[PDB]
Each structure stands twice: as C-alpha cells, then as structure tokens.
Design a protein around this ligand. Structure first.
Ligand SMILES: COC(=O)Nc1ccc2c(c1)NC(=O)CC/C=C/C[C@H](NC(=O)/C=C/c1cc(Cl)ccc1-n1cnnn1)c1nc-2c[nH]1
Length: 238
C-alpha cells in the first residue's frame, strides 16, 4: 500500500494473508473471508501455482511477524479460477479458495458482506484498500497491515486514464487524480472495502495498475457486484 497507515488489530477481520510454501514460505497475495470455508482473491495470484497443497491461509493477522512454523493456518482444498480468466488486464480476475477446514468466527476473523445487486446504483464514499504490499514500486512486503482511503472513479474517467486498455464494467477503479495513495506489489487479491449504512461491503478485489499511486493512474479492481452470481454458483453448489 502506498501512502497508507498502520491498521489497528481487528480493523479488517476479513483480510487474510495467503502464503506459498514453494520453494520457501513467503506472502503471495491478500484475500477476504466471505464464508466459513471461503476466501475471495485474485485469479492472477495463482500464476505458476500447480497445486493447492503449497498454499496456507492465515487469518487474524495484523503483523507478518505473528507467522512462524507453529502459527495455525487453513489448508486449501481447492483453487477455483473464473474460467473466462486470461490475465488481470483483461478482467475476470477472481478466484475462490475452498478451505480444508472451517473458520471459527470471532472478533479477529469474520466475513465481509458481498455487495447487493440492488446496490449496484449506490455511491460509495468511504472505501479503503488494505494489504502488506510494497509502499512504492521497489520495496518489500510490510510487517504491519496497511490501509489507505481511496475514492472510487467512474468507468468513463478510468477508461480515459487507461488508453490502450478496455476498462469494462466488470472492473472498478479507485484513486486520486494527483495520485499518492494506492495498492502496490503484494496487495493484489486483497479487498477494496466500502462502508455503507454502517455495513462493510466487498466492493473490489485489488487487481492491477500502471505503476503504483501515479497521478492519473487509478488502481483497477475486480468489480465484485458483477460476480455475485458466479460466487453463489461456486459456494452454494448442490
Ligand atoms: C517475501 O515475500 C514477498 O516478497 N512476496 C511477494 C512480493 C511481491 C509480490 C508477490 C509476493 N506476489 C506475487 O508475485 C504473486 C503473483 C502476483 C502478481 C501481481 C501482483 N500485483 C499486485 O500485488 C498489485 C498490483 C497493483 C494493483 C493496483 Cl490496484 C494498483 C497498482 C498495482 N501495481 C502496479 N505495479 N505494481 N503494483 C504482485 N505481487 C507481487 C508482485 N506483483
């Protein structure tokens, strides 16, 4: 996260840190708890991931230093990537992790509400991007979960900012015209959380941008409201 500040413990209890174990253990991506065996994240996170056996989901983490060999985690039973996904820049950048065991909800780990289809018209004015990602293009994973408040940008303005790309309505953009606050390397897969009527909603999934926090280059997020039926298809299968 660029231009962000340290989160407080329990502030983003749906935020997870997804680690890979191959070749050595390191943070891979962010994710959000959406159900008691379900993590919503970005499809591009699994580039070169040949098996869910190398994945570890850590919930209830503020500091990466809380993670050692004796720290509990959730194993991943299945990786579900949207089957129209090709690359982050073309959209469909969404994946589900089916966990091997159930998350016990509490004040340190609990789900974020998905957006309502009826609320595709609501204007979100209180949106935050969170993660342990870089603070600038050449940096390192941060110990403490960071947060940054960022305004949503219309599809029309985002398209003007990304000449040569096709910014679809399945993408949602967020950033200041002057830049300064954004997601960066290591934040992808994490949430873009917006508070509306005292309820937090998973509005976006951190996906891509041209550089980090650059002037007139908003961060591009998977527009979660456009995938609610796809999520229910995969999580509520009979
Ligand atoms: C010690 O542990 C580490 O160093 N881990 C460790 C360290 C680094 C990384 C990983 C693991 N994860 C991956 O490589 C998985 C595969 C993932 C690809 C892409 C992913 N992109 C982002 O996270 C965000 C991009 C992004 C998003 C928005 Cl909204 C705006 C601007 C963005 N940026 C443009 N340029 N940079 N950011 C990424 N993540 C990293 C590098 N790039």
């Amino acid at each position: 996260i660029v231009g962000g500040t340290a989160s407080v413990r329990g502030e983003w209890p749906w935020q997870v840190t997804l680690h890979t174990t191959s070749p050595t253990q390191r943070h891979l991506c962010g994710g959000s708890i959406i159900g008691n065996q379900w993590i919503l994240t970005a499809a591009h996170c699994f580039y070169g991931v040949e098996s869910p056996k190398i994945l570890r989901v850590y919930s209830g983490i503020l500091n990466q230093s809380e993670i050692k060999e004796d720290t509990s985690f959730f194993g991943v039973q299945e990786i579900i990537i949207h089957d129209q996904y090709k690359m982050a820049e073309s959209g469909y950048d969404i994946a589900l992790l089916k966990l091997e065991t159930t998350v016990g909800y509490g004040d340190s780990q609990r789900p974020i509400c998905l957006p309502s289809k009826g609320d595709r018209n609501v204007i979100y004015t209180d949106c935050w991007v969170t993660g342990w990602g870089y603070r600038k293009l050449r940096d390192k994973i941060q110990n403490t979960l960071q947060k940054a408040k960022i305004p949503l940008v219309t599809n029309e303005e985002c398209q003007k900012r990304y000449r040569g790309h096709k910014i679809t309505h399945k993408m949602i953009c967020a950033g200041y015209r002057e830049g300064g606050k954004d997601a960066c390397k290591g934040d992808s897969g994490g949430p873009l959380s917006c508070k509306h009527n005292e309820v937090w909603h998973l509005v976006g999934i951190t996906s891509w941008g041209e550089g980090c926090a650059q002037r007139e280059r908003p961060g591009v997020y998977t527009n979660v409201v456009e995938y609610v039926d796809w999520i229910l298809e995969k999580t509520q299968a009979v």
